[model samples]
Target: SALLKANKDLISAGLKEFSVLLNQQVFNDALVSEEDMVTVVEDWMNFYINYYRQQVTGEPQERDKALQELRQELNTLANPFLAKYRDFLKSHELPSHPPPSS
Candidate 1:
């Protein structure tokens, strides 16, 4: 909970950043089979661990290279997660987009 509060801005920025991608047709079209989905999730989990480690001691070029190497898998991981995160925010009364003013 404390970490959530501490990283609220960072989380919100990421949510807002990816919100557009979640609405894109291309993102929806990237669906995979059940078996492939399992691989995608596993790949993302590994990527997450590597990303954190890289951030701690790796160069910017190495981080970029890792992303480049896993771009497709990253997209697969991001699309659904972003959609779900967006839904969770809405369900919790946390607006990803502000309401239109009268």
Candidate 2:
């Protein structure tokens, strides 16, 4: 459910194909808990809102600072999720080297 588009590299840059592959790899994977997926997507949308609107609720840092703060918070939350998902990703290596390539 993460808003992150599927890794383009995986679908060789075909958006529709990537969507299908994403569904298979992410949704089909029993390891990725439903709760975690929902949280991941929610956090991503929240990040997007702050990024696009540039509207903070209260005291705002400069744009750069605001972005940095958001990233820090995101990373803090994401790391643990990645740790959980790593178990799945670890076994299934990308078929290609690097990324954004065939």
Candidate 3:
């Protein structure tokens, strides 16, 4: 529960940052879509991975710690999304109606 809260907070902070960028016209016109809120949120996590963990300065250990923390935060924030995905799979019975395996 605590981890989830941490993740939610981190995601909230990230989204706030993203809103600022959007206000500044930093994102490309076609890069994000109106119907892609979940993707945008997830991408924000990955984007930070590249920006801060991979390319940014400071020690590798510190960057790794940051990465792990951000990941936990993202996972916590995505609980609803995960639940929805499970619901979708259950309702669709995707595993039951299997494609031809031949």
User: What C-alpha lDDT values do all the predictions have?
Assistant: 0.47, 0.45, 0.52
Every model's Cα RMSD, please?
Answer: 13.3, 15.4, 10.0
The C-alpha TM-scores of every prediction are 0.28, 0.34, 0.40
Task: Answer with 1 or 3, whichever has the higher lDDT.
Answer: 3
Cα deviation of 12 in candidate 1 (Å)?
Answer: 7.5
Tens-place lDDT digits, model 2, residues 1-102 = 211233223223332332333344353344555566657545664655355345433234444444454555445555555554554444455533335456
The collision pairs in model 1 are: none
State the lDDT of candidate 3 residue by residue for 1-102, as single tens digits.
Answer: 323454445546765565453334323222433346556656766786566455423356655655676666556655545444434444343443336333
How high a TM-score does candidate 3 get?
A: 0.40
Stretches of candidate 3 off by over 4 Å are 1-12, 15-44, 84-102
Off by over 4 Å in 2: 1-53, 56-61, 88-102
Count of backbone collisions within predicted model 1: 0
The lDDT of model 1 is 0.47
Candidates 1 and 2, the one with greater TM-score:
2
TM-score of 2: 0.34
